[PDB]
Every structure is written in C-alpha cells, then in structure tokens.
Amino acid sequence: ARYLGPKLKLSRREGTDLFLKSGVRAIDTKCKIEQAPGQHGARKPRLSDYGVQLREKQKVRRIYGVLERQFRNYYKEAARLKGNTGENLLALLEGRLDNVVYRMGFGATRAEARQLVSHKAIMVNGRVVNIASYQVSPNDVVSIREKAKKQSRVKAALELAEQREKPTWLEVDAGKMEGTFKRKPERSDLSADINEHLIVELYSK
Amino acid sequence: ATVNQLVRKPRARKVAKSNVPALEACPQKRGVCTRVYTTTPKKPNSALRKVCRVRLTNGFEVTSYIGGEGHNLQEHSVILIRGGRVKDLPGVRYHTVRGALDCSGVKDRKQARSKYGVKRPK
Amino acid sequence: GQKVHPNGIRLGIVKPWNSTWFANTKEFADNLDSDFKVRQYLTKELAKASVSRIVIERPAKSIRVTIHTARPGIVIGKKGEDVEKLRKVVADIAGVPAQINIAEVRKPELDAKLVADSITSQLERRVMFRRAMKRAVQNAMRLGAKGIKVEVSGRLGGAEIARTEWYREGRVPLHTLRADIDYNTSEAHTTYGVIGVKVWIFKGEILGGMA
Amino acid sequence: ELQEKLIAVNRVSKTVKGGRIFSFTALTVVGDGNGRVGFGYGKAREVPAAIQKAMEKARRNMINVALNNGTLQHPVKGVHTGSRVFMQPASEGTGIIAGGAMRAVLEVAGVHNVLAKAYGSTNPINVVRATIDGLENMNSPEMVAAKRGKSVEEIL
RNA sequence: CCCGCAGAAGAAGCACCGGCUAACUCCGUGCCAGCAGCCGCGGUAAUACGGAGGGUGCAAGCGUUAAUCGGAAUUACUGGGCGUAAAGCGCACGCAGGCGGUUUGUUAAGUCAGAUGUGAAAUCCCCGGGCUCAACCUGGGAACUGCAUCUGAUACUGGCAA
RNA sequence: GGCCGCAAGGUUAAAACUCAAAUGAAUUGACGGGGGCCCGCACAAGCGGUGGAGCAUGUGGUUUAAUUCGAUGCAACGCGA
RNA sequence: CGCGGGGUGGAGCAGCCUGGUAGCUCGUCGGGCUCAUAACCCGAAGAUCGUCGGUUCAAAUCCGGCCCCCGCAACCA
Ligand SMILES: [Mg+2]
Ligand SMILES: [Mg+2]
Ligand SMILES: [Mg+2]
Ligand SMILES: [Mg+2]
Ligand SMILES: [Mg+2]
Ligand SMILES: [Mg+2]
Ligand SMILES: [Mg+2]
Ligand SMILES: [Mg+2]
Ligand SMILES: [Mg+2]
Ligand SMILES: [Mg+2]
Ligand SMILES: [Mg+2]
Ligand SMILES: [Mg+2]
Ligand SMILES: [Mg+2]
Ligand SMILES: [Mg+2]
Ligand SMILES: [Mg+2]
Ligand SMILES: [Mg+2]
Ligand SMILES: [Mg+2]
Ligand SMILES: [Mg+2]
Ligand SMILES: [Mg+2]
Ligand SMILES: [Mg+2]
Ligand SMILES: [Mg+2]
Ligand SMILES: [Mg+2]
Ligand SMILES: [Mg+2]
Ligand SMILES: [Mg+2]
Ligand SMILES: [Mg+2]
Ligand SMILES: [Mg+2]
Ligand SMILES: [Mg+2]
Ligand SMILES: [Mg+2]
C-alpha cells in the first residue's frame, strides 16, 4: 500500500519540493534537487502532452500519499459532486484526516501524521479514528489523546508547523493539542503551483 | 439511406468472426502434441521456429508456437495452449503456455519469468 | 569536380609566400628540408598558442622566423624565457643563427587557420559539428568578413557512413583571382577516425594588386 | 505575452535527378489567450529554420474570437478538406477535452472548457484550419442582437 | 469492541523502458538464438534478442489469454455515401406502397395541453442516516422516457364536403 | 440451391481460407522504338591514320621457386613507374 | 571573504518568469518643416543581451563558471 522507498527520489523525479521531509534542512542540502534520479538524471528529456498530464497527476498523488485506486475513486466522487471538478478533488484530498493532522501540526511529515493516526493517537469528536483516509467534516474537533500527548515528536512537529505558513481554514490550539476544522479549504487557500486541468483531462480521456 | 428504405430493410450488423475458433470462447485449452518440429518463417525474416501440431480435447487439430529458448516437449505430451498468432508463420494462431501441464519453464530466465513460467530464484 | 587550392592559385597575385628567400640549386633542397623541420617543430611546440602562419626569411647567413599568432602573451611567456628557448632550438635545427619575431593577429575569428583549428579542437572535445560550424560562421560574419564557407567531412558523430556538410554565408568568389580568399584546412583525430575541416574566408577584393 | 506551441514537424522529400532532397515542415499555433489565435505553416531544409518561419507566419495573420467567460458561446461546427469538427460550450471546470491539434489550438486561443470531437480525417493541418474556421464562424449575443436590430434582453 | 505485554520486531511483488506509450546504458550473441498487439527488430558497436545496473507504472496484487461495448461517423435514426476511390438497374411503362398546388367549412384520427389509473420491490440518480472510514446497509424523494381512460386546443398532417 | 434458357449460358448469390494493404487525384525526378527546339570533329565535306608487316611498350592468359602489388566499360592497358 | 541583487545600441529604461518574437524615450545623421534656431513630422544609423562555457531542433531568457558593479558583512587606533 504505502510507498516505502526513498522520498527525495520522488521529489527529484517530479522536480519540485513535495515536503516529504520535516524541513529542518534545505532539500538542496539533503539531495541534488535539480537533477533527476538515476544514471541518466542529468539528461532532461522533452515531455509530451501525456507525459506532462501523467507528471501532474503523479505529483499530487506523491504529495498526499494516495495510490491509484483510491485516487481514481476520489476523482469519480469529485466528478459526481456538483461544482468544479478539480476544486472538489483538491477539497477531498484536503479533507483526508492525515492531511488535516499535518496541517494542524501534529506531524513533521504527512507520513508521520499517518503514523500517529494509524497508531491510534487521534480523536475526532471524542472518537478514536484509525483510518488515514477518514474524511473530516466541517466543525469537527480533532485532538491528540492523552496517551500520545507525552510524545516529544508531536511537540517538535508543532514547532515545525509554527515555522510553516498557517492555514486559514483551520484553528488549532497547541496547548490543548486540538484543532477545529472550520471549513473546506478554497482553491485560493490551496497551492497555486498545482494544476488541476491536467488531472481532469487525464482521467477524462 | 432513406428512412422509408430503412423501414423496408434495416441495417444488418456486420458479424465479425473470431480469429481463434479452436478455443471456442475459452481462455486456454488442453491438447496432446501430435508432432513437434521446426518451420521456416515468412519472407523478410529467418529462423527455425518451434511449432507443435496438437490434437485438442474438442477434436480440433491445430498448430501452436513454442515460445522461449529451448523446450522439453515431444510426441504424446499433454500441453496447454492459448490464443495469439506469430504473424510470420502461416497458419499458427496459438501459443503454448510455458509452466503448464507437462511443459517446463524456460531455463535461466530472470525477466518475464511470469510469462515463461519461471519460479523466483533465491 | 576537383577545385584548385585557393592560396596556390593566388600566389603572386594577391597572396605572399610563406618562405621568402633566394637560393641556388645547390642549397635549394637542404633549405626546404630545414624549413620543413622548423615549421614542424614550431607547430608541435605552440599547438596550444594558436599559431596562424610561420614565415621563414633567410639572409645569406641567418634564419629569421616570424610567427603570426593570436595570443603573443602565452608564446613569449615570462619576459624572454620561452622565445629564447624556441630561438636556441630552431638555431640548432637550422644550423644557423636564428632570430624569431612574433606578429599579433588582432582578429582570430577572421583567420581561416585559427578558425579551422578551433573547430577541430571542438570536434575532438566531442561537441556537435553543426553547432561548432554555425558558431564559427556567425562569429566571422559578425566580425565583418565579406563571406565565409566552412566544410566538415567524414564520419560525423561517429556515423558509419561518411558525409560532407558545409555552410556558406555572404559571398566567397573562388574564381575571382583578385579576391582575398583566406583558406586553410585541419584534421580532427576523433575516436572514430579523421574528420577534415576546410574554411574559406572572403575578406575583400584588392584592386591595386600589390602582389 | 503571446503563447505559442509547435503541433507537428513532418519530413518531406523532393526526389531530384541526383537523389532525394529532404526538408522539414513545421505547423505552429500562436495566441494571446485573451481570444486572438493564429496558425502558421513553414518549410525549410532544417527543423529550426522551419519552426522559426512557421512562428513568424503564425504571429502574422491572427483572428479575433468572441469568447464567453473562457469558453464558447454556442455549439459550432467546422469543415475543411477532410476535417469535420464539432465543438460545444462545456461548463466551467470540465477542462478542454479535445484531440491533439484541436487541443493545441483551443489552449492557445484561451478557451478553458469545451467538448470537442474531430470527425472525418484527422490530418493536423486540415483539422487546425477547420477548428480556426469554426471559431471564426461563431457570433456573440451582442453581434446577433445588433444584426437582428434588437436588444440583448430580447435575445437572451 | 475495549484494556495490558513485548519488541521494528512477523509481512513486496509483478509488468514494462524503439514509436504508438511514462521510463536508457553496458555486456553476451551475429538474419543464429530469439522477440512481436501494429509498424517492425536480429547479417559484429542491437536504447526492440538474452543478462546486469538504473528507471517507469501498478501494488497484495501484477501480467497473459478469452469475451462485450467503446474508440468505429467502420450499418451513419441522432450521424455516411454512389462522375473518376466500393456504389445509379441498359431503358421505359406501371399495380401495391411512399409523397401531395391553393381557399373555405367540418371532424378531432395523428399532434399538443391538463387530469386520473397504472408503470412491483430491489437496482440507477439526489438529499440524509448507521456500521471508527470505505465497500456495505438503510429513510425519503426523483426517475421508470411507457400504456390506458377522461377533459380540452384546432396551427400543421389525415378524413369528409364544396 | 432456386428461376429462366433448345443450348451457349443468364439472373439471384455466399463461405472457409489468405494479405495489410488494394485504390483515387495530384507532386518532384528518371525513362519512352512520344513531340518540338538547340549545341558539341556528333554526323556530313575533307586530310591523315589504326586494323595487314617487322620491331618497341603495356595488359590478359599460360608458365614458373618467384614471374611483387595496384589500375582493368567510356573514365584500365607507353597507367602508379 | 560571508549573503543577496544586478550587468540589454552612447545614456536612461522593456523584454527574463511561460525557450522561438531584441522594444520604448533621450541622444546622432539626413530630409521635410522654420528666413534660420527652436519646436514638429518622416525616415536612416547604433547592443550582440558583461564574458567563458553547459543544455536543447532552437538560449537576452534555462544551468554553471569567470569577470566586474551595487547592497548588505562582523575589524580598526
Ligand atoms: Mg583538377
Ligand atoms: Mg477515416
Ligand atoms: Mg517515451
Ligand atoms: Mg520483451
Ligand atoms: Mg552489442
Ligand atoms: Mg531487451
Ligand atoms: Mg480483447
Ligand atoms: Mg457505432
Ligand atoms: Mg464513407
Ligand atoms: Mg477503376
Ligand atoms: Mg468505381
Ligand atoms: Mg444510366
Ligand atoms: Mg395540402
Ligand atoms: Mg394519401
Ligand atoms: Mg385526438
Ligand atoms: Mg421500481
Ligand atoms: Mg457516515
Ligand atoms: Mg434507497
Ligand atoms: Mg384539419
Ligand atoms: Mg384539412
Ligand atoms: Mg446458378
Ligand atoms: Mg572543336
Ligand atoms: Mg566520318
Ligand atoms: Mg597488329
Ligand atoms: Mg585483357
Ligand atoms: Mg598483376
Ligand atoms: Mg587484381
Ligand atoms: Mg595512355
């Protein structure tokens, strides 16, 4: 299920920074971010239309940690749902519980947040939720249970999150170690470098 | 073209026959090697391609290509055949399944092992 | 067809001779051997000094070499150390007291020999032959040559089948005797064999003749 | 400001007394995104010269297209030598769903949401020309109201 | 279902990398061995045959074969054609059949509108709810493009009359 | 198979199998015992030759221990030499 | 030396982001314009995009090196 290989390899192949590491050190210092991975990394082949569409889809999937079947189901639900298809797809991926935990700051990486969620450190409305793909609803309180409140990695992740740029659609209390999911993140709140048209076209072949 | 003409005589869908009628809408079928031999390929290319005349369980006698390097097959050897033609071999429209009943996997293969019935090396 | 050498067909009319000395038939052949030796040694030494034209001039009891080069700084080196070394070696080769002069070429992009040598250097360094030849043509035309033609020949890019490729810009009238066509060749010894490079540079037409 | 993209490069021959002389043809499309789109077709002995000639030709001979909020105003058909083309004003968010040459032409034109399909021949040159012609033969509500002598409210 | 114990401890594979099609180099072999869905590849520098390294795509699955629709506007009703690419009977007369210049009246068959009955439940779709999420289950609606009967409209088509 | 025909045959009209093309129009060459125009000791008009004789020289062939190697329609054969 | 930014006709400025297209103003010349200057109009000339390279079908643009310029950089008794 989960990708268990080197993460900077994915970052180099994609080209951009996927935030696959905690971010204490520069990714340029941790790896040759410019060069592609492999024996023929220095060469930069010209990508075709299908190549760039596939590249964009892979970027989103690698960022969020979602395999093809689950991602395809997300697209199907987004297309079914009313409104803009790409915006709905991004909204669902944001709605994922592990993404929510990472955004609030109870995890250095999304993998670390997923680790906590799987190991039963997360309570949603006073209910211990175990699935990373759990869709968080608006006006949901998400809190760290007392068993995991003693973990030092949570505090370190909170400091890293304080370093990062804060999301407007969440309200997190670090002392209580709990955040409320105020609303679905708008497309303006989400990152601009991500392109949705390519994903929509690729899955609408 | 005219709707009146169409009402009189509708358009009759063009029934496309299958290119592997010996399988009879089955994925694979069992047979007995009547003869094992080699044949010369068609014009632009050259080789000695290994083929088997096989009597199928449903009466049909077909010719089937043997993929991979080397084979242990001989006469009176039960084999499993599947669809797929070799193009530059006239009248050969079926492949033998390597790693099937009384058919050994290709020796010393490290890639496409699943296609050639080769078990994982340690 | 087969074309005549542009320099050889224009000797006397517009082009001067490289060796300029008189000798009777008694000493003619020995002079030729010594001149060949001097030129060979000088090219081998100053391969990396961008030497364009060695001009040999013999007083009755002296040998005067004149090296036309793009970068005098490297050939002379520290004060007179390198020129003195070259002077003493050429003196022993010739068997006569020698005197070396150095003429600076202010425009190495218009000298056909230098352009050809640079292209062969690039070819040996495994650049793309079209890229190298286009760069040379653009540089010459920008510097203000009335025309330039460059030709490369033989196993381009390690191809089994040999080909010839040539690019011309401006005009290069070969049949006009009064024209000033600087022409020279070079050979790149690449890992796949020899690649020949020919360069014509039409700098202008000399009306006065001036020999 | 002008976004440009190369659709296809094709090798052609002349077959002269000596041997065969090869040359390259470049089909390009440029556009400002805001509605102006123009195609160009060039030919040279070498690919870079052909592409540059095509770019120059495409930069010239542009045509304005009436765009409604980044999409078409009504379903439009377009025809040419072999290419029969249909295009539909799809809703916002669907993206440009078109095949190859039509995708390139519409993307540089600036239409973000259409449902298109190319019938008949799908030769890149003819389909580009047919798509541009179809875009040209597309009037706006203001244009139809003016020509019919009515207000936009009467036309709706 | 919850709580406690221990220790990263017990848990990754398959296909592909010449173009179509995302992903390249070296070695072995020499129209042989072999590959192949199509185009093709191999005769001594093979990114296409085998091995290796690297990479790409899926992932407890991954490939191959069989089968249906799609792409196929390639049976074209929506939605094709017939001078030369396949396609105008050798030519005419003519029954059944198809189609019908113009005005008025009438009928209300076709047509249109409304209403009533029915069109089982499940399935599909919309808004919700319950399984920690999902699959799954479930409440209500919508839909079931239809058929029948009744009441109206009379522009067009049909019938009848001039 | 049916129908028609004295017969020749006509009419209606498939399938297995096989190939990945078959075709239409037009484009650039080359060719034509197609057409027009033009030029060159190309022909025609002339002079002198070669092919016959002897010898010189080169090549092929044969021979030889070796008869070194190359050039071998025009455009190799008093050629590298 | 540390970090950052910059180098585009003679000057002052776009073009860099999205790889294909060298633009604007002043200045120079000529002509018209003005009796003439000036002003105004029309033409003409002027960078190889600091340089050395790398990538690519193609580089002012993408990448690196060097050269400089500027800002920041903790040291003068
Ligand atoms: Mg000659
Ligand atoms: Mg077609
Ligand atoms: Mg590819
Ligand atoms: Mg294979
Ligand atoms: Mg090899
Ligand atoms: Mg292989
Ligand atoms: Mg199938
Ligand atoms: Mg269909
Ligand atoms: Mg048709
Ligand atoms: Mg015909
Ligand atoms: Mg016909
Ligand atoms: Mg007729
Ligand atoms: Mg009527
Ligand atoms: Mg009637
Ligand atoms: Mg009625
Ligand atoms: Mg029902
Ligand atoms: Mg629920
Ligand atoms: Mg229900
Ligand atoms: Mg009526
Ligand atoms: Mg009536
Ligand atoms: Mg018959
Ligand atoms: Mg004459
Ligand atoms: Mg005669
Ligand atoms: Mg004789
Ligand atoms: Mg002979
Ligand atoms: Mg001989
Ligand atoms: Mg010989
Ligand atoms: Mg002779």
UniProtKB/Swiss-Prot annotation, chain A:
Keyword Hydrolase tagged: no
Keyword set, alphabetical order: Ribonucleoprotein, Ribosomal protein, RNA-binding, rRNA-binding
A Pfam family of this chain: Ribosomal_S4
Span of domain S4 RNA-binding: 95-155
Alphabetical GO biological process terms: ribosomal small subunit biogenesis; translation
Gene Ontology terms for molecular function: rRNA binding; structural constituent of ribosome
Entry's Gene Ontology cellular component terms: small ribosomal subunit
SMART domains: Ribosomal_S4, S4
Quaternary structure annotation from Swiss-Prot or TrEMBL: Part of the 30S ribosomal subunit. Contacts protein S5. The interaction surface between S4 and S5 is involved in control of translational fidelity.
Function: One of the primary rRNA binding proteins, it binds directly to 16S rRNA where it nucleates assembly of the body of the 30S subunit.
Protein family (similarity comment): Belongs to the universal ribosomal protein uS4 family.
PANTHER family: 30S 40S RIBOSOMAL PROTEIN, SMALL RIBOSOMAL SUBUNIT PROTEIN US4M
Protein name as annotated: Small ribosomal subunit protein uS4
Gene label: rpsD
Curated annotation (Swiss-Prot), chain B:
Gene3D superfamilies: Nucleic acid-binding proteins (2.40.50.140)
UniProt protein name: Small ribosomal subunit protein uS12
Keywords recorded for this protein, A-Z: Acetylation, Antibiotic resistance, Methylation, Ribonucleoprotein, Ribosomal protein, RNA-binding, rRNA-binding, tRNA-binding
Self-association and partners: Part of the 30S ribosomal subunit. Contacts proteins S8 and S17. Interacts with ArfA. May interact with IF1 in the 30S initiation complex.
NCBIfam families: rpsL_bact (TIGR00981)
Modified residues (3-methylthioaspartic acid): 88
GO MF terms held by the record: misfolded RNA binding; rRNA binding; structural constituent of ribosome; tRNA binding
Superkingdom field: Bacteria
Gene assigned in the entry: rpsL
Family: Belongs to the universal ribosomal protein uS12 family.
Curated annotation (Swiss-Prot), chain D:
Top-level division of the source organism's lineage: Bacteria
Complexes and interactors: Part of the 30S ribosomal subunit. Contacts proteins uS4 and uS8. With proteins uS4 and uS5 encircles the mRNA as it enters the ribosome, which may play a role in mRNA helicase processivity. Can be cross-linked to mRNA. In collided ribosomes contacts ribosome rescue factor SmrB.
Biological processes per GO annotation: cytoplasmic translation; maintenance of translational fidelity; response to antibiotic; ribosomal small subunit assembly; translation
InterPro entries noted in UniProt: Ribosomal_Su5_D2-typ_SF, Ribosomal_uS5, Ribosomal_uS5_bac-type, Ribosomal_uS5_C, Ribosomal_uS5_N, Ribosomal_uS5_N_CS, Ribsml_uS5_D2-typ_fold_subgr
All copies of domain S5 DRBM, residue ranges: 2-65
Keyword Iron-sulfur carried by entry: no
Job of this protein: With uS4 and uS12 plays an important role in translational accuracy. Many suppressors of streptomycin-dependent mutants of protein uS12 are found in this protein, some but not all of which decrease translational accuracy (ram, ribosomal ambiguity mutations). Located at the back of the 30S subunit body where it stabilizes the conformation of the head with respect to the body.
Record-stated family: Belongs to the universal ribosomal protein uS5 family.
Designated name of the protein: Small ribosomal subunit protein uS5
Gene Ontology terms: cellular component: cytoplasm; cytosol; cytosolic small ribosomal subunit
HAMAP family: Ribosomal_uS5_B
Keywords: Acetylation, Antibiotic resistance, Ribonucleoprotein, Ribosomal protein, RNA-binding, rRNA-binding
